Design a binder for this molecule. Structure first.
Ligand code: ADP
Ligand code: ADP
Ligand code: ADP
Lengths: 496, 496, 496
C-alpha cells in the first residue's frame, strides 16, 4: 500500500492530463496565439507542488521543570485563494511529506465544494497522551506564535483547524494567543482559526458537519436514477442497507442521518472488533452503549462479527476511519455497490481500478468528507460578520410567514361570507416546529446541504463531459484542477 | 570526509560540553537554586537547532516563454539577536540540510566577532549559468517577495547577502524589489540586504573585507610569541612563506595583503591547476594575468605544479575555496605549520585531530572568514545612519588636527624669539596622505581591524582558560556558545 | 512634612510665576498682540498636570496555583517631548498621586539636563519580597503587555526604567516581552526600556552614572570663582573636605570620585550609624569593608559618631539617601558651605530659605542627581543605534593620535641632524592607559560630564538673570519651565 503522497500526486497527474487537452481547445481557442498555449500547461506544473513549507523547532518548559524542544510544520499548498485553510495534527507520526500531501488534498477539496481557501496542513511531532493539559496548551500557544511571526496563521493568511488529534480547546487557545499578541489590532483576530468553542466564537453545527456532509454526499447520488441504474438500485423492497467502518464521530453521525431516512444499518466495526445484525441496528442505542462503557463490543441485539465489516453484504459501505482500508486484495470481495469515502484516502488507486471493473460507485473523499470544511468556511465568515447567523432576521421572517398565510386565509374567506371560516393561518406541525426553534445551526445545515448538492451536480457534469464512468474521483480532481487553473490563468504568474 | 552538518553539529556539541560545567559553577553559583541549574543546559538544546526554515517553490517565465518552477530555502538558525544575517546561494547542489548547517555556523561566527546578528542562510536549487541575466533577476525578485511575505527578508528580521554564487547585482535587485513592494513604507528598506552596489547603498570597502579579515586573522596570531613558539616560528631569516588554495576573491586579497607585509607567496592553486616558484609570486602580476586571460594557468615567472598546493612546502597554508579540502587522508602530508581557513569548513574533524597531533595551528573558519560579516554589520548600520561613515566629521577632525599641530608650534616658538622659526605644523608625509584622502573605507577598515584583534585576544584567552592548545576552533565555538548562551539566559524562553 | 506631590506642585508654581513676567516682555514683546499674550500663560496651566494616567488590574497565577489580581499605574506627565521616560516602582505604598508627582518631576529634571523625554512614572502595588523570582517575572511581563496595548510602553512612546525597587532583570523581561509580542516588527523594540543588562542591550557605565553625575555637578560649581567667593572657598591650604550621608550606590561613587580628585572625605553615615575622622577615610577600604561584612559599622581607621553626619564640619555635605533629611530644624546647624543633593528632595523648602539666609549653596536634586537620567537617554539611543559607542572609531582615533605625535616628532627632529633624537611619539602614561583601554563607558562618561557642565552653566545663568542667589533649586525649576514652555509655545495646543 503506497503512501498518501504518491497517491494524491497520482490522482492529480491523472486529472491534470485529462484536463490539459480540453483546457486549451473548447475553453480558449478563439484567441489562440501560436498554440504555444499548450505550453501554458506550466500553470498545472505550478499548481502541483506546495508553494511554502515552514518547519520549526520551539521550546517549552514541561511541568516538571525540564526543557524540551518540539518540532512541527505547516505547509501551504496553494495561495490561488488568499486564506489558506487546513488543520493541525499532533502525533509522533507526522512528516513534512505527509502535511505536504494533505495540504495538497485540501486545495483541491475546497475547490470541489467551492470553498475559497488554499490547501494547507500542519503537524507537531508530539504525542498528546504524554503531555499534561497545561503542557499541551503551552505547546499550542508557542506554536501559534512562531506560526504567526512567519505568516502561517492569520485571519487573512492561513486559518488553521483541528484534526482528529486536536480539539476545540487547542483551537480556542490558538485563537486567543493570536488575538492577544500579533493580532492584537486585527478586528477579525478571532477568524485566525476555526473549529473553536461557541463561547470563543465557534459556529453552531460544527460537530454534525462532516457527518451530515457524508449523508448529503450519498443522498445526492442515490437519488439520481442514471447512476442508480448502472448499479441497479434506488429499490422498492429493500430500499437501502448500509455498513460503516469506524464508529468515530463522522461514522456515528453518518449512521444517524443515513438511518433517520430509511436505510438500515446492518454492520458497524471499530478498531477493536465488529457487530452484525441483518435486521438493523439503532444509532441512538449503539451510541449510548459506546458511551456508557468502553467500546461497541458486546452490544445486545447484535452478534459480534470477526474482522472488518468491509465485506459484510450491504448496499452502502462507508469507510469512516483509518487510511488505506480497501486495497487490491479485499477489493473484489466487497458486496457493496456504493462506497462512500467518509475519511481521507480509505481506498487505494489499485482498489479504484477494481471497483471500476465491477461497477462500483466510489464517492470520493475529496468530495464526500468535505462537509466539515464547508462549515469551517462559514465559521470563518461568522467571525468576520460578528453576528450569529439569523440574529436579525429570524423574527422578521417568522412574521413575514404568518402574514403570507394570513393573506391566503383572508383572501380565501372572501370567497365565502365568513370572517374566520377557513384557516390557512396554520403552519404544518413541522413548519411550526421549525420557526419556533429557528437557530444558527439551521441556516448552516442548509448552507451545507446546498453546497453538497451543487457540488455533486458539478462532479456529475464534469464526469459526463469527459466520459468518465463511475470514476467519480478523477472526475472530481479534474473539476478541481480546472477551477484552480481558471484562477491562475485569469491573471498570470509574476505577470499575474 | 563527513558533511558540513555533521561537522558543525560536532563542533557545537564539543564546545557545548566544555562549557556546561563552568557555565554553572563560577558563572552563576552564588544564587544557586536546587542545582537544577544543570538542568538549564536545555538552553543549549534550544540553541543547537535552527528554529525556523522556509522552503518554497515559485515560478518564473523563462525568456523563451516556457514556465518553470524553482525551488529554494532560507533557514534562520537563531533569533537570539534580532536581524538574522546570512547569504544566498544559487547552485544545483544546495540542500536544506546544508543551509541549515551554514546558518548554524553564522550564528556562532557572528558571536565570535561580536556582530549582533542571528545565523541564517538561503539556497536556490539553480545553476546561474543556465539562466540569462534577465531570468536570473526575475528569479531573485520573486524569491525576495515570497521570502518577504513570510518573514525571511526584512531590515529588522533577516538581512540576506551574497555568496560565491551570487553578486552585488542580485543583492541590488533584492533590495529594490523589497523597497518597492512590501517594504515601501520602511525608512530603512535598503537595509534589507547587504553586499550591494555603492550606488544602491553599499559600504566602501566591502570587497577587500573578507580578505583583509583573513589577513588580520593570521597576523594577530603570527605576532603572538606564545603560539609562534609552539610552532617554532616568527622567524628572522625566512620571515614567512605562504600558499593559498583558491584564487577567488578572498584568496586574491589574502595573497595581496599577506605579501604587502613581508610574506612570500610560493604557490597558488585554482580549480584548474596550480603554480609554484620558491622565489615568490607577485599579487598584482598574478592578478592581472588572471584577468587579461582566462585562468592563472600558463603564468610566466612560475612553473605549473600538478594537483593541489595543499602539500607545497610553506609556512602558512590558506584554503580559500571549496569545502572539505583537508581530510584524514592528505592531512599528515601538509608541510605548513599554520592553516588559515579562508573559507567555511575546508578541514574535516578528522583532519583537525591530525593537525593537532602534529602541532599545527588551524585558524577557524568561524573566526578567520568573519571579516565579511563584520563589515556587513557596518553596512547595515551605514544604512540605519543613512550616511557614509565620516561624511560629517572628516573635515572637522582634519581641522582639529591642524589646530593641534599649530599649538605645539606656537607653544614651541614661545621658547625662542621668532614667530615662524619652528614648524611642527607639518604632518608626516603619510599623515598628509591619510588626511587628504580620508574616506569611508578608512573607517570601515579600522573598524574591521579592531574587531579582528579584539576577537583574536578573546579566542586566545578562552583557549588558555580551558587549557586547550592550538585547538583554536573549539575555543572559538566555545567562546560563541558562551555569548549566545548569556543572551538567552539573561532573559529566559517563554518567560524570557 | 508635606507629600512629594504638594512639594513639586509648589516648586512648579513658584518657578511658574517667576517666569510668567519675563516670559512675555523681553522674550517676545517684539510682535506683541493685544497684550493678551499674558493670557497665553495658559500653556503653563497645561504644563502643570499630567496629561495621561493609566491604572490597571491584571491577574497572575502565583506558583502555588492560586489566582490574584495586581494593581498598578503609569502616568505620563508631558509629551512635549515624544518618548516619555521614567521608571517602574514595585511597592505596596505606591499611589497614583505619587507616580503623578514623580512623573511631573522627571519632565522638568530631563529639561534641566537637556534630555529629550517627557516625564513619566509607574507603580505596581506589590512587595517583591513576597513573590518568587518566577512570579515577579510573570507580573512584570503581563504588566508590559497591558502597558503596551494602551500606549504606555513603546520605544517612541514611553520608555520605562528601573527604580530602587526593581532591577535590570525585570527591565530585561520588559524589553523581551515587548520585543516578542506587540513590538515584534519594531526594529527598535529593545529601545522600549532602558536600564537593561549589557547582554540585553544595556549601556556600559550605567552604574557609575548617577554617582559621576553628583561629582561633576559639584565640580562645575566649585571651579566657578564667583560662587566660590560668595562662599569663600576654592582654598589653598585645606583644598576641599566633604561628608556624605548614605553609603548606597550614589554616595559611594560620589565619595570615590570626589576623593580621586583631592577632596578628603571626613565622615560617612548610613541607616545604621556613622563614622568620622578628620584625617580622611578611603573609598576603597570602606567600600570593601561594607562588602566583606554587613554595614560600615566598626570600621578601623575611623571612630563612630552618633546620629547623622549632616552636622559634621566639612566643606561639602552630600545627602545621598532618604527624603527630607535637612529640615528647618537642624538647617542652621550645618557647618557645610555647599550642599550637593545626591538624592531626590533631601532638603525641605523651609531649609532652603535658611541656607539662603546663611549663604549656603545648595545644588538641586533636579540637576545634581540627573546623571542617571542622562546616561539613560544614551542607553535609549544605543538601542536605537544598534552599535556600541566607539565600535568604529576607537582604532581610527588611536591611529590618528599616534600620527599626530609622530609628526610633532619628525618635525622637531628636522631642527637637529638625527632621525630618532627627539621622542614625542610617546604618550603620557595616563594617555597610554586611556588609549589602551578605550571603551564605551569612556564615551558615556564623557557625554555625561558635558551634559552636567552645560546644564550647570545654564542653571547659573538662569539664576543671575532672575537675580536669584543661592536658590539654585528654583533657578533650576525656572530654567526647566522655560524650556518646556518654549516647546509648547513654538507650536500651540490644538493648533499646536
Ligand atoms: N478553491 C477554489 N479554487 C478555485 N476556484 C474556486 C474555489 N472555490 C470557489 N471557486 C470559484 O470562485 C468563483 C466565484 O465565486 P461564486 O461562484 O460567485 O460564489 P460560490 O463560490 O459560493 O458559488 C466560483 O465560480 C467558483 O468556481
Ligand atoms: N551573537 C551574539 N550572541 C550573544 N551575545 C553577543 C553576540 N554578539 C555580541 N554579543 C554581546 O553583546 C554585548 C553588548 O554589546 P557591547 O559589548 O556594548 O557592544 P559590542 O558587541 O559591539 O562590543 C557584548 O558584551 C557582547 O558580548
Ligand atoms: N525636555 C525638554 N523640554 C524642552 N526643551 C528641551 C528639552 N530637552 C532639551 N530641550 C531643548 O532642545 C533644544 C534643541 O537641541 P540641541 O540643543 O541642539 O541638543 P542638546 O539638547 O543635546 O543640547 C535645546 O535648545 C534644548 O534646550
Amino acid at each position: 500500500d503506497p503512501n498518501f503522497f504518491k497517491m494524491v500526486e497520482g490522482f492529480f497527474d491523472r486529472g491534470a492530463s485529462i484536463v490539459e487537452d480540453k483546457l486549451v481547445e473548447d475553453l480558449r481557442t478563439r484567441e489562440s496565439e501560436e498554440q504555444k498555449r499548450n505550453r501554458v500547461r506550466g500553470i498545472l506544473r505550478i499548481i502541483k507542488p506546495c508553494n511554502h513549507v515552514l518547519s520549526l523547532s520551539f521550546p517549552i518548559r514541561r511541568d516538571d521543570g525540564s526543557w524540551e524542544v518540539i518540532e512541527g510544520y505547516r505547509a501551504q499548498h496553494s495561495h490561488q485563494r488568499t486564506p489558506c485553510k487546513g488543520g493541525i495534527r499532533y502525533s509522533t507520526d507526522v512528516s513534512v511529506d505527509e502535511v505536504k500531501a494533505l495540504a495538497s488534498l485540501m486545495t483541491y477539496k475546497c475547490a470541489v465544494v467551492d470553498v475559497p481557501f488554499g490547501g494547507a496542513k500542519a503537524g507537531v511531532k508530539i504525542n498528546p497522551k504524554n503531555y499534561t493539559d497545561n503542557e499541551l496548551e503551552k505547546i499550542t500557544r508557542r506554536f501559534t506564535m512562531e506560526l504567526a511571526k512567519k505568516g502561517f496563521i492569520g485571519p487573512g493568511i492561513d486559518v488553521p483547524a483541528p484534526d482528529m488529534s486536536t480539539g476545540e480547546r487547542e483551537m480556542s487557545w490558538i485563537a486567543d494567543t493570536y488575538a492577544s499578541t500579533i493580532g492584537h489590532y486585527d478586528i477579525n483576530a478571532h477568524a485566525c482559526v476555526t473549529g473553536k468553542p461557541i463561547s470563543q466564537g465557534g459556529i453552531h453545527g460544527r460537530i454534525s458537519a462532516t457527518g451530515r456532509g457524508v449523508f448529503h454526499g450519498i443522498e445526492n447520488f442515490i437519488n439520481e436514477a442514471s447512476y442508480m441504474s448502472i448499479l441497479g438500485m434506488t429499490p422498492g423492497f429493500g430500499d437501502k442497507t448500509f455498513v460503516v467502518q469506524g464508529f468515530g464521530n463522522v461514522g456515528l453521525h453518518s449512521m444517524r442521518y443515513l438511518h433517520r431516512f430509511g436505510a438500515k444499518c446492518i454492520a458497524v466495526g471499530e478498531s477493536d472488533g465488529s457487530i452484525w445484525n441483518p435486521d438493523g441496528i439503532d444509532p441512538k442505542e449503539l451510541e449510548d452503549f459506546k458511551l456508557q462503557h468502553g467500546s461497541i463490543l458486546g452490544f445486545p441485539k447484535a452478534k459480534p462479527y470477526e474482522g472488518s465489516i468491509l465485506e459484510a453484504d450491504c448496499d452502502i459501505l462507508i469507510p469512516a476511519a483509518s487510511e488505506k482500508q480497501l486495497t487490491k486484495s479485499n477489493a473484489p470481495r466487497v458486496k457493496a455497490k456504493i462506497i462512500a469515502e467518509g475519511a481521507n484516502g480509505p481506498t487505494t488507486p489499485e482498489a479504484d481500478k477494481i471497483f471500476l471493473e465491477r461497477n462500483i460507485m466510489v464517492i470520493p473523499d475529496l468530495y464526500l468528507n468535505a462537509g466539515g470544511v464547508t462549515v469551517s468556511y462559514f465559521e470563518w465568515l461568522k467571525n468576520l460578520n460578528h453576528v450569529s447567523y439569523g440574529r436579525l432576521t429570524f423574527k422578521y421572517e417568522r412574521d413575514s410567514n404568518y402574514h403570507l398565510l394570513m393573506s391566503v386565509q383572508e383572501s380565501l374567506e372572501r370567497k365565502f361570507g365568513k370572517h374566520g371560516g377557513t384557516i390557512p393561518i396554520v403552519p404544518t406541525a413541522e413548519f411550526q416546529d421549525r420557526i419556533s426553534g429557528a437557530s444558527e445551526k439551521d441556516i448552516v445545515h442548509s448552507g451545507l446541504a446546498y453546497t453538497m448538492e451543487r457540488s455533486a451536480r458539478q462532479i456529475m457534469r464534469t464526469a459526463m463531459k469527459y466520459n468518465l464512468g463511475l470514476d467519480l474521483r478523477t472526475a472530481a480532481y479534474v473539476n478541481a484542477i480546472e477551477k484552480v487553473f481558471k484562477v491562475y490563468n485569469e491573471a498570470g504568474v509574476t505577470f499575474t
